[PDB]
Amino acid sequence: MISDTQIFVALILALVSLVLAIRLGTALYQ
Amino acid sequence: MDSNFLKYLSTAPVLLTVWLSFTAGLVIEANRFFPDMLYFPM
Amino acid sequence: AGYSPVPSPDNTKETYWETKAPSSQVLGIGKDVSSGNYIVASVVAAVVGAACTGQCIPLTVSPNPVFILGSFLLPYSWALHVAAWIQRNNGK
Amino acid sequence: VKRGSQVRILRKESYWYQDVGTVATIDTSGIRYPVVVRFEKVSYSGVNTNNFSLDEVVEVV
Amino acid sequence: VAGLTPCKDSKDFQRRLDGSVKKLKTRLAKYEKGTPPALALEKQIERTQARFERYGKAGLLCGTDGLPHLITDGRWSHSGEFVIPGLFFLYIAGWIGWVGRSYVLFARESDKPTEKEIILDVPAALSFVSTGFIWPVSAFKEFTSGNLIADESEITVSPR
Amino acid sequence: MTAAYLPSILVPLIGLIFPGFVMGFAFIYIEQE
Amino acid sequence: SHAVKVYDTCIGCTQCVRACPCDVLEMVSWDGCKAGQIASAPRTEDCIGCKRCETACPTDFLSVRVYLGGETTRSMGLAY
Amino acid sequence: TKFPKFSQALAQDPATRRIWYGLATAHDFESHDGMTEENLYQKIFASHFGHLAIIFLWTSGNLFHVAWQGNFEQWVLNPLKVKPVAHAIWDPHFGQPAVKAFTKGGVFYPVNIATSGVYHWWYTIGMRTNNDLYAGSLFLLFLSGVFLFAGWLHLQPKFRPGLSWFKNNESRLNHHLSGLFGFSSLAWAGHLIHIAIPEARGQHVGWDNFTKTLPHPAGLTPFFTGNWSLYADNPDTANHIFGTSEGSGSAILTFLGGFHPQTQALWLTDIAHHHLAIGVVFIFAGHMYRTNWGIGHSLKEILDAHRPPGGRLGAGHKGLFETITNSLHFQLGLALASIGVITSLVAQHMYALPAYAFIAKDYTTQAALYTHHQYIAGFLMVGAFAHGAIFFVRDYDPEQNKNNVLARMLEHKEAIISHLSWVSLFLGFHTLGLYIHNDVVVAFGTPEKQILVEPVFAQWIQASSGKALYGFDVLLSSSNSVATNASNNIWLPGWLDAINSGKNSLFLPIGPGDFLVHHAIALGLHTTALILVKGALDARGSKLMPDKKDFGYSFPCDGPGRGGTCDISAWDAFYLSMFWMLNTIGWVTFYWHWKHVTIWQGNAGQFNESSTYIMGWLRDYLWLNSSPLINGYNPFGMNSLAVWAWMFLFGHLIWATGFMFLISWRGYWQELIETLAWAHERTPLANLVRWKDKPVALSIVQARLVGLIHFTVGYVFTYAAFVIASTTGKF
Amino acid sequence: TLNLQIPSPTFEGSTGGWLRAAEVEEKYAITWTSGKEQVFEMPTGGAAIMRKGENLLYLARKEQCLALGTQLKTGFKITDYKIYRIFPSGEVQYLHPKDGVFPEKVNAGRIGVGNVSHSIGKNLNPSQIKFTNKSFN
Numbered sequence A: 001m002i003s004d005t006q007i008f009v010a011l012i013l014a015l016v017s018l019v020l021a022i023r024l025g026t027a028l029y030q
Numbered sequence B: 001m002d003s004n005f006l007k008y009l010s011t012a013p014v015l016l017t018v019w020l021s022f023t024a025g026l027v028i029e030a031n032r033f034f035p036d037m038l039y040f041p042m
Numbered sequence C: 001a002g003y004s005p006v007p008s009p010d011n012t013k014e015t016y017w018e019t020k021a022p023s024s025q026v027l028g029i030g031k032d033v034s035s036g037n038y039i040v041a042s043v044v045a046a047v048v049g050a051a052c053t054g055q056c057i058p059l060t061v062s063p064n065p066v067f068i069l070g071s072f073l074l075p076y077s078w079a080l081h082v083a084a085w086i087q088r089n090n091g092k
Numbered sequence D: 001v002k003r004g005s006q007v008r009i010l011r012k013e014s015y016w017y018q019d020v021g022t023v024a025t026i027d028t029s030g031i032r033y034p035v036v037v038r039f040e041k042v043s044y045s046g047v048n049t050n051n052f053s054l055d056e057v058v059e060v061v
Numbered sequence E: 001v002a003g004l005t006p007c008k009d010s011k012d013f014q015r016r017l018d019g020s021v022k023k024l025k026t027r028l029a030k031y032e033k034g035t036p037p038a039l040a041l042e043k044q045i046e047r048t049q050a051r052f053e054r055y056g057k058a059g060l061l062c063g064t065d066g067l068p069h070l071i072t073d074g075r076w077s078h079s080g081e082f083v084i085p086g087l088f089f090l091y092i093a094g095w096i097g098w099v100g101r102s103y104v105l106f107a108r109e110s111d112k113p114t115e116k117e118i119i120l121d122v123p124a125a126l127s128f129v130s131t132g133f134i135w136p137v138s139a140f141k142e143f144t145s146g147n148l149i150a151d152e153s154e155i156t157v158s159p160r
Numbered sequence F: 001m002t003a004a005y006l007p008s009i010l011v012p013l014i015g016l017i018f019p020g021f022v023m024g025f026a027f028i029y030i031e032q033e
Numbered sequence G: 001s002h003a004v005k006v007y008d009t010c011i012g013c014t015q016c017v018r019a020c021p022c023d024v025l026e027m028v029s030w031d032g033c034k035a036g037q038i039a040s041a042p043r044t045e046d047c048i049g050c051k052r053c054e055t056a057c058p059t060d061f062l063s064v065r066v067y068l069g070g071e072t073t074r075s076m077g078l079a080y
Numbered sequence H: 001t002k003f004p005k006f007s008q009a010l011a012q013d014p015a016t017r018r019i020w021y022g023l024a025t026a027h028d029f030e031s032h033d034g035m036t037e038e039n040l041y042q043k044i045f046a047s048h049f050g051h052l053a054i055i056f057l058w059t060s061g062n063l064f065h066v067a068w069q070g071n072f073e074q075w076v077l078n079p080l081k082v083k084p085v086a087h088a089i090w091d092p093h094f095g096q097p098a099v100k101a102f103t104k105g106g107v108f109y110p111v112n113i114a115t116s117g118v119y120h121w122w123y124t125i126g127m128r129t130n131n132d133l134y135a136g137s138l139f140l141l142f143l144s145g146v147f148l149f150a151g152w153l154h155l156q157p158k159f160r161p162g163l164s165w166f167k168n169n170e171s172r173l174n175h176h177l178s179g180l181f182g183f184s185s186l187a188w189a190g191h192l193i194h195i196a197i198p199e200a201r202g203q204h205v206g207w208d209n210f211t212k213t214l215p216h217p218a219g220l221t222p223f224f225t226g227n228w229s230l231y232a233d234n235p236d237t238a239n240h241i242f243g244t245s246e247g248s249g250s251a252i253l254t255f256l257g258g259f260h261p262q263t264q265a266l267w268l269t270d271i272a273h274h275h276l277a278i279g280v281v282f283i284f285a286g287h288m289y290r291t292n293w294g295i296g297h298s299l300k301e302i303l304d305a306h307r308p309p310g311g312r313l314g315a316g317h318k319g320l321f322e323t324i325t326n327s328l329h330f331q332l333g334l335a336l337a338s339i340g341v342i343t344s345l346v347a348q349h350m351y352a353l354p355a356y357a358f359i360a361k362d363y364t365t366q367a368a369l370y371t372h373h374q375y376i377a378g379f380l381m382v383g384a385f386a387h388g389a390i391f392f393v394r395d396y397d398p399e400q401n402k403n404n405v406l407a408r409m410l411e412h413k414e415a416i417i418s419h420l421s422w423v424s425l426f427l428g429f430h431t432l433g434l435y436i437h438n439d440v441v442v443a444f445g446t447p448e449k450q451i452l453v454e455p456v457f458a459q460w461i462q463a464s465s466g467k468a469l470y471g472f473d474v475l476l477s478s479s480n481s482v483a484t485n486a487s488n489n490i491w492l493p494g495w496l497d498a499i500n501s502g503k504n505s506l507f508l509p510i511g512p513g514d515f516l517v518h519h520a521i522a523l524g525l526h527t528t529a530l531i532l533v534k535g536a537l538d539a540r541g542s543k544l545m546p547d548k549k550d551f552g553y554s555f556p557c558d559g560p561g562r563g564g565t566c567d568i569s570a571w572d573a574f575y576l577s578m579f580w581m582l583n584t585i586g587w588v589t590f591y592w593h594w595k596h597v598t599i600w601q602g603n604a605g606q607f608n609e610s611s612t613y614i615m616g617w618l619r620d621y622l623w624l625n626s627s628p629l630i631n632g633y634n635p636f637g638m639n640s641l642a643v644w645a646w647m648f649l650f651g652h653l654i655w656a657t658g659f660m661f662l663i664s665w666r667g668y669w670q671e672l673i674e675t676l677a678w679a680h681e682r683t684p685l686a687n688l689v690r691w692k693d694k695p696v697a698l699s700i701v702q703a704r705l706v707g708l709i710h711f712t713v714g715y716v717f718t719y720a721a722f723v724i725a726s727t728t729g730k731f
Numbered sequence I: 001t002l003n004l005q006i007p008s009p010t011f012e013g014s015t016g017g018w019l020r021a022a023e024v025e026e027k028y029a030i031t032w033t034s035g036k037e038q039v040f041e042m043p044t045g046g047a048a049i050m051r052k053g054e055n056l057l058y059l060a061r062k063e064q065c066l067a068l069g070t071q072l073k074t075g076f077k078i079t080d081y082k083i084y085r086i087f088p089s090g091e092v093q094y095l096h097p098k099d100g101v102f103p104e105k106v107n108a109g110r111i112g113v114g115n116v117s118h119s120i121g122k123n124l125n126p127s128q129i130k131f132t133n134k135s136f137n
């Protein structure tokens, strides 16, 4: 019932969150 | 009796063993003559 | 000793007391109220709160808002009588 | 506090804090901790004697 | 009666008695009459029956499991279950503690307290043991005279 | 290319490649002057 | 390395110096005790932290204290 | 090296201790090199943002997997018969038998059956389709991104908060009580009224429909007219099929009390009213403290003013304002203790009063949730006490706390610890003695000689709440009581129906076994508290080490000097309290699981009779219920419980491994590793390779921690496997 | 100074001797004069025979060197043992009898390091030395 397009949108949001997580990790590491 | 032997009997482990054996005998005889006392009879 | 100073709200006074009664700054907006005023307020609040509570003890499906509001005077009367004491022993 | 006198210890780090000992000697030379106090109770390290200052000992009645 | 039924009129209690007696009788059936095993098993049966009868008459309450339950709330109808036994304990325990403390002080004021504590002075120990029978009034007398509680400034304490 | 292939495509990654690369990089970082 | 410190409760008994498996403690001159000597810790970089000095100390709580700090080869006693 | 960038003392270590301690001290910011208070607070703020993002991502992953590989849509049809599947299994190690054994839930691929209850939770909320779950997961991914961005932003130079802002107690308290708690619960009530209840009555309400769909036929006129009772008229009938319009009502707010008949859970209207009421209460509570305007209180003023004139508390609460505001460990301890109490309450109340539809009949889910939350509660309580001890070591200022309540606690710590030890010994001696007495008499075949004490106090409390099973006739069991007459026409009918039916876990009947296990729990709580309180109070010093605060919180020891000083730290007090906390929660969860298993199979007499001696627990609970689990796989085949059997043995293994670190200590291993290093250096063809960090044995504190972690993992995994597998194999 | 030509106590060899860390970081040495040929115990393990005259020995740890020195001082009556530390550069250093006299007896010239002017009870609190450069002394 969950389509591949839906899963791809979820993956894109996950990638955005990963980029933001890397940014936060760097800022905290400083 | 030798005073040294009496002191040896007065030593802590001997007295503890004798006293606790006496207490165990007291409890055992109490349970032998008045057994199964789960309550104070009233 | 290197801790930053602790921020407190504006107009924060010293309320610590080892006297017989607090300094009447503990009562805030009611610091200038009279001890007799507090006594009468406490008695009236106790009576009204008890009456409004009794009017609602067998709570129905449609309780009266005014009785609900007035029932909150019984707890209020306690504070009022405590204040009366404080204000009586602070000189007023 | 004199020699052969009962003194209660007032040093907080001491094993004998608020405990009584007997003064064995008081050295008037001018050292930091002149008085010497002997105790019946042994400490954890096994020593029953110590050196105290005059402000860390109070005579008992 | 509190929340349960009297044990004297409980089918569960009767069933438990019957089961115990039947187990003993089955064990007895394989032994010749008058032999030590038969006599021992018959005495066991008699003891079981006496125990169950005494429990029934004691007024004990029994639950659905068929076993007596104790009501240790303060009810005077069930004092014999916890309170009076508890009073007997407290008496004996206070006796023991009072005499032990007395002997500790006695040995403290001796030439060699440690020697008196490892090798006892049993005459004085028996003296204190005898004294222990009025320990409640003696202990309260000590407390009021101030010989029991030590002052805060005379007890060693660690630094904060 | 359906979503049913994603488990087979990813589990080996997340379970062998990501741990291997993370371990190698962390090793290089911790042992580094 | 570990931080070894000496306090005025020192009586100059020297047992702390004699108990040290390394050579970290030495006796120096002083006027605050009858013996006229006080312990000092000049070679604290060789300390291993065994606290033998602490064990061989007769004053009510120790006049010599070892505070275990950063670990080095000598502190860890690594012959390799 | 530059691994522990926050500690040169570790960066300069030539051994593996550098790596280990850099791992274990990464989050102790206060101890880091050149750490200022502002940097500390700002880093904590950003770390909180990251933690919230992690939580959102975790819940989003749950929702996404249930939407993608789940059977939610076919579970909402027959929730009492369909098993909820958590996620699909793709393990290249499975054989065909394993794939077939795990292919369940009505799906056609191996799956895991959820034990978290998320299915019931979401169904109750109003989720019906997989698209709803997918949208929720998308929103939670977006929220995680937003919070990560917020954390990054608030580390920027022009956005980093100041300490005058971090220490602003009144504004934070007002906002957390009013908005975070109050308005949040008000919004939950709004959700329950606009979506959950219509969805439970078969009317779909969503973003495309909620602006045109009235939650109540009267609209908001009853609210804005003062005729609020119109929102309670016409509740759902007793024959309401949850999720359908058959038997539904129109009420949105009520106080029926008790449980919905079909779902066997609390009324959704009751939940909505609960949340609305607590929301307005919290909004009122959030207006207490002073802010940029003149109204309100000041916590400093209140604390300083509260000193009983009798002087039995000394200076009262003077200085506590500064102490708490300047000590993050004091705040951490308070928060951890409160959250631990609340999660225990969550566990205790959520099994007695289920709130989700059909959750009560998911036996494995209920046991899993209860065990989960009790273990979390115990962890949180241990942490609260550990951080109280850390506060005493690090942040305590005696001159500031001159003769206030805290200083008085430290003053009579000896009395506190001695009385706690006495009560612990009291409880232990007598509870264990009664258990052994019962064991011996039952063993000799005289169970009638057991000491079985009826928990008359707890039974009296139950009767007061309205349980007629025991004959007490106190407050609500009494039909002529003022308590009964006051609530007879609001909630008492439904509440009595719920309490006096044996179909639920609400106020389960109790007996002497419950009495004994309760006193065992009391012993456990008191002994864990003893260890933790002693650690906290002796953290600053003792007669053995009267200068412990100089050495800190988690130093290894003070040497064999004064007769031996092993485990002389507050950290070591925590380390032992963690064994005791694992023991107490084990007792609690054993009691819960056995009682509920016996009730579920209907043989409550088994518990009532065997709970009175320890052989009963060992035989009729562990030995009896371990059969399906240990048969998960056997020489004759395997089933889905094979994973739980494997995890059972895994827990046993890691537990026994932790025993290694806890019993064997450092010197032996350091003298063994020396020989190993010699061998490597003198082995040809392997001396070509050389370690860059000198291989050393584990430190004393490190070994204690590692053994504790292994012990805890074994504990938790073993009991998780046992509980879930036994429940799933029995029902 | 250290003379690297002093003979050694005719040891038979062992696996407890120094390792690559001795060649890379630090290698300690001990020299002592013996009146006769006795048998002593190596701090690393095993027996060795000391020579009549001067004996030089190499070890990996100052603790091993000082344990050997203590054995010589107590078991035997040799107290002229000197300890050195050698780096790969060859920069021999002199350590044990630093001032020519053992530390157990006071000697004029030493400067007190690590001495504090109060008892341990007068140490400050970590709360008082928090977020500051003060020392707990």
Ligand code: CLA
Pocket (backbone or CB within 6 Å): F011, F012, F013, F015, F016, F017, F018, F019, F020, F021, H092, H093
């Ligand atoms: C969680 C992640 C994970 C994954 C995805 C796999 C996957 C696999 N394991 Mg398992 N394994 C894991 C964890 C995992 N393992 C762990 C934690 C352990 C330790 C207990 C093991 C221990 C283990 C053993 C002992 C064995 C496997 C085997 C297998 C294989 C399944 C059976 C088969 O017929 O393949 C086999 C058929 C093949 C054609 C194998 C092709 C594999 C290619 C070459 C992989 C590519 C490697 C890649 C280039 C390395 C990159 C390195 C980089 C990260 C630095 C498969 C490759 C079996 C096997 O045959 O492994 C080789 C096997 O004997 N595993």
Ligand code: CLA
Pocket (backbone or CB within 6 Å): H023, H024, H025, H026, H027, H028, H029, H332, H336, H379, H380, H382, H383, H384, H386, H390, H553, H554, H571, H574, H709, H713
């Ligand atoms: C939200 C609450 C909270 C917060 C903010 C903190 C914050 C802090 N705690 Mg902690 N603490 C908490 C809860 C909290 N704690 C709880 C609940 C407990 C009780 C268990 C403790 C007990 C505790 C102690 C006893 C100590 C701290 C310490 C600290 C400080 C240093 C943290 C550190 O060293 O990280 C540690 C870094 C880690 C990476 C942790 C590694 C170990 C964890 C537990 C993982 C083990 C599980 C394993 C990986 C799972 C395997 C799975 C299996 C299937 C294979 C820091 C201020 C230390 C400190 O500085 O004290 C002064 C300290 O000594 N805390």
Ligand code: CLA
Pocket (backbone or CB within 6 Å): E082, E085, E086, E087, E089, E090, E093, E094, E096, E097, E098, H422, H423, H425, H426, H427, H429, H433
């Ligand atoms: C056959 C049954 C039985 C058995 C085998 C025991 C065995 C024990 N009881 Mg006892 N106990 C029993 C029945 C039994 N009890 C009953 C029925 C009650 C209810 C009244 C108690 C109430 C009780 C208490 C209140 C205490 C014990 C304690 C103990 C233990 C130590 C006793 C001791 O050292 O005495 C030797 C005596 C001393 C060392 C002197 C000091 C202690 C005693 C008990 C003081 C008595 C007088 C004092 C004024 C009482 C104040 C009580 C109040 C604070 C509640 C011991 C394992 C003690 C314990 O567990 O301590 C950790 C303890 O304090 N028991």
Ligand code: CLA
Pocket (backbone or CB within 6 Å): A007, A010, A011, A014, F006, F007, F008, F010, F011, F014, H053, H054, H055, H057, H058, H059, H060, H061, H062, H064, H087, H088, H089, H090
């Ligand atoms: C934190 C929540 C979470 C968890 C525990 C899991 C767990 C799992 N996912 Mg993943 N997954 C998640 C969120 C999560 N997912 C989300 C939000 C999505 C939508 C984008 C997906 C999409 C997804 C797919 C499409 C697949 C999995 C699969 C899996 C399984 C193997 C791991 C894998 O391939 O990951 C791969 C994951 C990704 C490529 C993207 C999601 C990565 C998340 C967001 C990382 C979150 C990290 C966390 C917040 C913090 C880490 C803490 C740190 C201490 C390690 C495993 C059951 C595979 C499988 O075999 O399932 C049966 C599979 O095919 N997941």
Ligand code: CLA
Pocket (backbone or CB within 6 Å): H044, H045, H048, H049, H052, H165, H166, H168, H171, H172, H175, H176, H178, H179, H180, H181, H184, H342
């Ligand atoms: C209305 C305004 C507002 C709001 C909404 C928040 C919200 C928040 N602030 Mg706060 N904050 C505010 C004003 C506000 N703040 C102000 C004015 C200041 C400056 C004076 C601060 C200063 C501040 C700081 C310094 C910090 C926060 C933090 C937080 C977060 C706390 C952690 C959390 O999410 O707990 C969630 C808690 C709840 C949802 C409610 C309480 C939970 C209890 C247990 C009830 C449980 C409910 C229910 C039964 C659970 C079941 C649900 C389901 C599973 C069935 C949270 C997002 C912390 C953070 O994480 O920052 C990122 C933090 O460090 N705030």
Ligand code: CLA
Pocket (backbone or CB within 6 Å): H421, H422, H424, H425, H426, H427, H428, H429, H432, H523, H527, H530, H531, H576, H577, H579, H580
């Ligand atoms: C089953 C194992 C076990 C037992 C019996 C105990 C017992 C105890 N622990 Mg615990 N403890 C355990 C495991 C256990 N611990 C483990 C694994 C750890 C982790 C290291 C700890 C860590 C720990 C700490 C840190 C502390 C305790 C404390 C206690 C006491 C709690 C109060 C109590 O129950 O008193 C009742 C006493 C008992 C249940 C034991 C009595 C045993 C028998 C029945 C007595 C009769 C003896 C008999 C006559 C001897 C005959 C034999 C002879 C001929 C040789 C008590 C001494 C606390 C304490 O000391 O409080 C005072 C405390 O601070 N424990």
Ligand SMILES: CC1=CCCC(C)(C)[C@H]1/C=C/C(C)=C/C=C/C(C)=C/C=C/C=C(C)/C=C/C=C(C)/C=C/C1=C(C)CCCC1(C)C
Pocket (backbone or CB within 6 Å): A007, A008, A009, A011, A012, A014, A015, A017, A018, A020, A021, A022, A024, A025, A028, H050, H051, H053, H054, H057, H148
């Ligand atoms: C799907 C699709 C559609 C068409 C185009 C496109 C090429 C994009 C194509 C491909 C997309 C691809 C390959 C997407 C890949 C998805 C990926 C890599 C998803 C992974 C997401 C991972 C996430 C969140 C991780 C979150 C981790 C967090 C918070 C960690 C927290 C933290 C920790 C643990 C330590 C301290 C720092 C911090 C940040 C607080």
Ligand SMILES: CC1=CCCC(C)(C)[C@H]1/C=C/C(C)=C/C=C/C(C)=C/C=C/C=C(C)/C=C/C=C(C)/C=C/C1=C(C)CCCC1(C)C
Pocket (backbone or CB within 6 Å): H329, H330, H332, H333, H334, H337, H341, H381, H384, H385, H387, H388, H389, H391, H392, H533, H536
């Ligand atoms: C309201 C109601 C309903 C039904 C009838 C009933 C009579 C029950 C009635 C009353 C209920 C009441 C009064 C309930 C009482 C519950 C209470 C008081 C719960 C409190 C639990 C306390 C806990 C965990 C305390 C934990 C303390 C900790 C970590 C302390 C740590 C600390 C240490 C060690 C050093 C200093 C710093 C710090 C953080 C403070």
